[PDB]
Design an enzyme around this catalytic site. Sequence first.
Site, PDB file in Angstrom:
ATOM      1  N   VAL A  51     -89.894  21.381  33.786  1.00  0.00           N
ATOM      2  CA  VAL A  51     -91.278  21.729  34.090  1.00  0.00           C
ATOM      3  C   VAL A  51     -92.144  20.491  33.881  1.00  0.00           C
ATOM      4  O   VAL A  51     -92.083  19.844  32.824  1.00  0.00           O
ATOM      5  CB  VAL A  51     -91.758  22.914  33.223  1.00  0.00           C
ATOM      6  CG1 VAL A  51     -93.270  23.000  33.222  1.00  0.00           C
ATOM      7  CG2 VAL A  51     -91.127  24.254  33.699  1.00  0.00           C
ATOM      8  N   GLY A  52     -92.946  20.159  34.891  1.00  0.00           N
ATOM      9  CA  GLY A  52     -93.776  18.974  34.823  1.00  0.00           C
ATOM     10  C   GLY A  52     -94.571  18.789  36.093  1.00  0.00           C
ATOM     11  O   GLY A  52     -94.897  19.772  36.766  1.00  0.00           O
ATOM     12  N   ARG A  53     -94.846  17.532  36.460  1.00  0.00           N
ATOM     13  CA  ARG A  53     -95.741  17.252  37.580  1.00  0.00           C
ATOM     14  C   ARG A  53     -95.083  17.447  38.950  1.00  0.00           C
ATOM     15  O   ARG A  53     -95.798  17.681  39.934  1.00  0.00           O
ATOM     16  CB  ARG A  53     -96.291  15.823  37.466  1.00  0.00           C
ATOM     17  CG  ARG A  53     -97.676  15.610  38.100  1.00  0.00           C
ATOM     18  CD  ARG A  53     -98.059  14.130  38.079  1.00  0.00           C
ATOM     19  NE  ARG A  53     -96.915  13.275  38.400  1.00  0.00           N
ATOM     20  CZ  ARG A  53     -96.806  11.993  38.065  1.00  0.00           C
ATOM     21  NH1 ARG A  53     -97.755  11.372  37.384  1.00  0.00           N
ATOM     22  NH2 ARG A  53     -95.716  11.317  38.424  1.00  0.00           N
ATOM     23  N   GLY A  54     -93.748  17.371  39.042  1.00  0.00           N
ATOM     24  CA  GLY A  54     -93.076  17.340  40.324  1.00  0.00           C
ATOM     25  C   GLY A  54     -92.638  18.704  40.840  1.00  0.00           C
ATOM     26  O   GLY A  54     -92.836  19.744  40.208  1.00  0.00           O
ATOM     27  N   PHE A 105     -90.944  21.727  41.314  1.00  0.00           N
ATOM     28  CA  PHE A 105     -90.082  22.455  40.393  1.00  0.00           C
ATOM     29  C   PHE A 105     -88.797  22.913  41.090  1.00  0.00           C
ATOM     30  O   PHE A 105     -88.835  23.450  42.204  1.00  0.00           O
ATOM     31  CB  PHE A 105     -90.834  23.649  39.797  1.00  0.00           C
ATOM     32  CG  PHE A 105     -89.998  24.461  38.881  1.00  0.00           C
ATOM     33  CD1 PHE A 105     -89.201  25.492  39.381  1.00  0.00           C
ATOM     34  CD2 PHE A 105     -89.956  24.159  37.535  1.00  0.00           C
ATOM     35  CE1 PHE A 105     -88.397  26.211  38.552  1.00  0.00           C
ATOM     36  CE2 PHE A 105     -89.166  24.870  36.692  1.00  0.00           C
ATOM     37  CZ  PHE A 105     -88.378  25.903  37.193  1.00  0.00           C
ATOM     38  N   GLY A 106     -87.652  22.682  40.434  1.00  0.00           N
ATOM     39  CA  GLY A 106     -86.357  23.029  40.986  1.00  0.00           C
ATOM     40  C   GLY A 106     -85.742  21.967  41.866  1.00  0.00           C
ATOM     41  O   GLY A 106     -84.570  22.103  42.245  1.00  0.00           O
ATOM     42  N   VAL A 119     -87.305  18.272  41.508  1.00  0.00           N
ATOM     43  CA  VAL A 119     -87.604  17.029  40.798  1.00  0.00           C
ATOM     44  C   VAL A 119     -87.729  17.295  39.300  1.00  0.00           C
ATOM     45  O   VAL A 119     -88.455  18.207  38.885  1.00  0.00           O
ATOM     46  CB  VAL A 119     -88.882  16.377  41.342  1.00  0.00           C
ATOM     47  CG1 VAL A 119     -89.403  15.359  40.358  1.00  0.00           C
ATOM     48  CG2 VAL A 119     -88.595  15.727  42.671  1.00  0.00           C
ATOM     49  N   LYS A 136     -84.582  13.557  41.774  1.00  0.00           N
ATOM     50  CA  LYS A 136     -84.719  14.558  42.829  1.00  0.00           C
ATOM     51  C   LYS A 136     -83.337  14.958  43.315  1.00  0.00           C
ATOM     52  O   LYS A 136     -82.646  14.151  43.944  1.00  0.00           O
ATOM     53  CB  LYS A 136     -85.569  14.017  43.970  1.00  0.00           C
ATOM     54  CG  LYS A 136     -85.492  14.799  45.281  1.00  0.00           C
ATOM     55  CD  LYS A 136     -86.085  13.913  46.373  1.00  0.00           C
ATOM     56  CE  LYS A 136     -85.938  14.481  47.755  1.00  0.00           C
ATOM     57  NZ  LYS A 136     -87.093  15.359  48.075  1.00  0.00           N
ATOM     58  N   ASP A 157     -91.764  14.954  54.868  1.00  0.00           N
ATOM     59  CA  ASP A 157     -92.399  15.992  54.058  1.00  0.00           C
ATOM     60  C   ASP A 157     -93.645  15.436  53.379  1.00  0.00           C
ATOM     61  O   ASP A 157     -93.751  15.410  52.150  1.00  0.00           O
ATOM     62  CB  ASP A 157     -91.416  16.530  53.020  1.00  0.00           C
ATOM     63  CG  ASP A 157     -91.874  17.838  52.398  1.00  0.00           C
ATOM     64  OD1 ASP A 157     -92.638  18.572  53.058  1.00  0.00           O
ATOM     65  OD2 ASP A 157     -91.470  18.133  51.247  1.00  0.00           O
TER      66      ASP A 157
END
Length: 299
Positions: free
Chosen positions: A16-19, A21-22, A24, A37, A130
């Site tokens: 869990v953080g800035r990127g 989720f699942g 990065v 990633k 993306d």
Amino acid sequence: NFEEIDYKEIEVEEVVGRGAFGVVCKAKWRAKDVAIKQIESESERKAFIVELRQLSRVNHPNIVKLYGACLNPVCLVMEYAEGGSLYNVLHGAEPLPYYTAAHAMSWCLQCSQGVAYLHSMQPKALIHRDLKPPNLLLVAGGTVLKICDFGTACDIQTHMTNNKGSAAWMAPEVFEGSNYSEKCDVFSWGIILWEVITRRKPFDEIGGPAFRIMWAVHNGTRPPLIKNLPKPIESLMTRCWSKDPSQRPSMEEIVKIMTHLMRYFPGADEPLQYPCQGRVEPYVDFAEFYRLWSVDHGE
């Protein structure tokens, strides 16, 4: 020096953080802080591994460093840079930074400069695939923008099935055929330009799951026109949105147009510092642009 990294050399910190989720994670490798990633499906893994060489050649001021790649599990290891995602700067929790038209145009210009570098690479272009504010990072007091994640080659089936959260920025030919091309990144760029100018979430009025957005834009829906937007800007914006990818500018055209227009947007190097209190009204203010334009051309 882009390396082939052993996954054992990675110590993962938190999921869990800035990127994203699942996809990065923030981890550490050697002594450095990195973002890992994972490349998920087999279609994406195949396209990713083929292009590791191009990725190893990427070097540009508006792209985070890429340290290497792992081949089991397939993943990209990049620099974890400190800053805020453009998404959270625009749409995050209620004490938000104030920003000007100059900042808006500067962020979009920097985005196009990094992507043009990607497209121009020789012999084969690198397509980002993306582009969206969650994948762009603001650093240096909110004045420098960096691409902090790369897109992957997703199979047609997967667009309506594994919401990667890209629907508002996804070119219709990507939705229908996964025709990732230079023009798909250009389409996403046009949406992002609307998004920073209005500070609004694209296609927010469309409920239902994510795929309803992709059906909307595939049927031709676009964000509303922007009240009193400078016509050179509106023309660039709407040409970027076109259904026909050939009617869309190239990233090099976008860099040159936007570089020109920056003469009407002074002050983009002022750090963010203050908090802030049919067609759609813009968040940013174009009055200075109009004054400077007339200084150059008269009424």
